Design a protein around this ligand. Structure first.
Ligand code: MZJ
Ligand code: CL
Length: 271
C-alpha cells in the first residue's frame, strides 16, 4: 500500500518462526507473511552489499518466474539490515542434502535434480540472465524433493573483494572455465561450465570438485586442459553430458536447451 512499491514488502507483515543459519550476507529465517504464507527472509548484513544496485536489480528479478527457480517475493529496504523475501525451501541447500547418506539416492533421482536445475537455467538463458555463481551450495531443495536455483546473479552486489575476482581467496575457482580464470570472460558459456561441475557434484553426492587440490592447483590443472573425471554413480551417457560442458572452447559447449534435451534422452533410455 502507501509507502511501498511493487518490489517492496512491509516487514510488519512478517512473523519470524525459525533460524535457517548464517551465510556471507548474514542470517536467514523461516517465517510467515500475513499470518499464512511461508517465506524465507534473508537479512543483509550492513557493509556486505552494494545495496542501491541490488535494489534496482531486484525489480528485474521480480519478473523472473519459473517452477525450478526460487521466487523472489520482494525486498524490505526502508530499514537496516535490508531483507530479501523469497519462497521457502524446507529441505535446505542441495550441497548438504547430497551429503546426507541416509537418503540412499537412486541415480534416477540424481538425474531429476540435474533436470530441475537445467530447466531453471534454460529459463534464465531465455531471459539473457546469467547466474554467475552456479554451484550445489547455491541450489535449494523443497519439501517435495524438488531442486531450485537460488542466489541468481547475486554475486554482482557483494562488496567483499575476496569473493569478486580470481585473485580473491573466496572466488569459485572450482566452478570456473579457463577463460574466466585467465581473462575474466563471463558468458552464458561460463554458466554452462559451472552446470557441468554441478552435475558432477550431484553424481558425487556432494564431494568437493578437485578435492585433493587447492584452488591454485585446480586453476593450473584446468589450464593444462585436464578435467574432473567420471563419478562412480554416473553412467557413460550422463558423464558425456557433464563433460560436454567443459570444452576448452566456450563456443563448442552446449546451450541449456541442448543440455535439457540430452538429459531427457538419457532419462528415457535409463528409465
Ligand atoms: C549449503 C548452503 C547452506 O548451508 N544453506 C543453508 C542456509 C541458507 C538458507 N537460505 C534459504 N533457506 C531456505 N529457503 C530459502 N529460500 C533460502 C534463501 C532465501 C533467500 C535467498 O536470497 C536470494 C534468492 C534468490 C535470489 C537472490 C537471492 C537465498 C536463499 C542457504 C543454503
Ligand atoms: Cl519447501
Amino acid at each position: 500500500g502507501l509507502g511501498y512499491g511493487s518490489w517492496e514488502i512491509d516487514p510488519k507483515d512478517l512473523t519470524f518462526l525459525k533460524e535457517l543459519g548464517t551465510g556471507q550476507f548474514g542470517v536467514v529465517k523461516y517465517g510467515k507473511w500475513r499470518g499464512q504464507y511461508d517465506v524465507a527472509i534473508k537479512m543483509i548484513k550492513e557493509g556486505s552489499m552494494s545495496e542501491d544496485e541490488f535494489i534496482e536489480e531486484a525489480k528485474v528479478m521480480m519478473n523472473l518466474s519459473h517452477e525450478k527457480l526460487v521466487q523472489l517475493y520482494g525486498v524490505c529496504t526502508k530499514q537496516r539490515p535490508i531483507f530479501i523475501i523469497t519462497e521457502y525451501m524446507a529441505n535446505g541447500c542441495l550441497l548438504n542434502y547430497l551429503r546426507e547418506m541416509r537418503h540412499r539416492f537412486q541415480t534416477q533421482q540424481l538425474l531429476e535434480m540435474c533436470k530441475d536445475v537445467c530447466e531453471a537455467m534454460e529459463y534464465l538463458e531465455s531471459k539473457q540472465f546469467l547466474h554467475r555463481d552456479l554451484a550445489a551450495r547455491n541450489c535449494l531443495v523443497n519439501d517435495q524433493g524438488v531442486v531450485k536455483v537460488s542466489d541468481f546473479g547475486l554475486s554482482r552486489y557483494v562488496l567483499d573483494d575476496e569473493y569478486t575476482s580470481s585473485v580473491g581467496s573466496k572466488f569459485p575457482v572450482r566452478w570456473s572455465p579457463p577463460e574466466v580464470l585467465m581473462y575474466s570472460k563471463f558468458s552464458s558459456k561460463s554458466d554452462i561450465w559451472a552446470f557441468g561441475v554441478l552435475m558432477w557434484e550431484i553424481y558425487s553426492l556432494g564431494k568437493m570438485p578437485y578435492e585433493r587440490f587447492t584452488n591454485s592447483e585446480t586453476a593450473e590443472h584446468i589450464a593444462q586442459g585436464l578435467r574432473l573425471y567420471r563419478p562412480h554413480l554416473a553412467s557413460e551417457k550422463v558423464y558425456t553430458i557433464m563433460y560436454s560442458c567443459w570444452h576448452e572452447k566456450a563456443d563448442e559447449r552446449p546451450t541449456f536447451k541442448i543440455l535439457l534435451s540430452n538429459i531427457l534422452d538419457v532419462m528415457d533410455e535409463e528409465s
